[PDB]
Design a protein around this nucleic acid. Structure first.
Lengths: 112, 105
DNA sequence: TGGCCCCACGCGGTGC
DNA sequence: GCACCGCGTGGGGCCA
DNA sequence: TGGCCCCACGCGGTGC
DNA sequence: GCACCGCGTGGGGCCA
């Protein structure tokens, strides 16, 4: 399809997203820019065409669904492992036995 | 390669219980799976996960195994009902959201 | 306590 | 410059 | 702050 | 009736 976003940009949106719902909402603005001008064409639309409103382009809405169900959970785990587990593993490997300040306080007290 | 490094469900569950967070959980698995680096000789100091900063690289086989346990205890979010019950309401809300709140107007 | 552990964070290095 | 990556560091809570 | 943003929720309409 | 569906609404968190 033509309205494809880059893998890297999609990952960025996942990271910036506050929740899965907010993640979809961000993709909506990113993929439907014409509705989100200061003209607020967005107000004439919803996802289904309910309440006498126009229906959001189901092609792009199906793409948003794809990112939510196929990419979003994988990128959320990927970002947890890389940003939390890996830093913690490295910290544990390089952690000193005694702090630099605790060593110097002993170095001072022992000679004073 | 790992016959001994293979942890049972009971052993993994115990490590989860003493760990304070997912990150700390990964750190404990590191100690549990790399006992030779965490002796009083502190060979751990020559290593990190990638081999950056002139350090040696942790065995990527066991490091992948640590990942496996981390995602085995803290798995993927099953998005089954999420699209219909969370995303769709948010999409409609964003489409109808007013510029100013009415209480502020 | 005071020692061990966890994690947050300013930092310099890297690399384009 | 700036996005990214591990370091050294110390506040701080738990524990024995 | 105050503007932007997010999301929860009572509500009437719809449709079986 | 009743389960379901988008609406209009306002409490509240983030930020510069």
């Amino acid at each position: 399809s033509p309205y494809l976003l880059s893998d890297k940009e999609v990952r960025e949106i996942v990271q910036q997203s506050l929740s899965v719902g907010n993640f979809a909402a961000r993709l909506l603005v990113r993929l439907f820019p014409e509705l989100f001008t200061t003209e607020n064409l967005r107000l004439q639309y919803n996802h289904s065409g309910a309440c006498n409103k126009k229906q959001l382009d189901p092609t792009r809405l199906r793409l948003i669904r794809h990112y939510v169900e196929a990419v979003y959970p994988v990128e959320k785990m990927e970002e947890v492992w890389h940003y939390e587990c890996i830093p913690s593993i490295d910290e544990r490997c390089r952690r000193p036995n005694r702090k630099k300040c605790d060593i110097l306080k002993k170095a001072k007290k022992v000679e004073k």
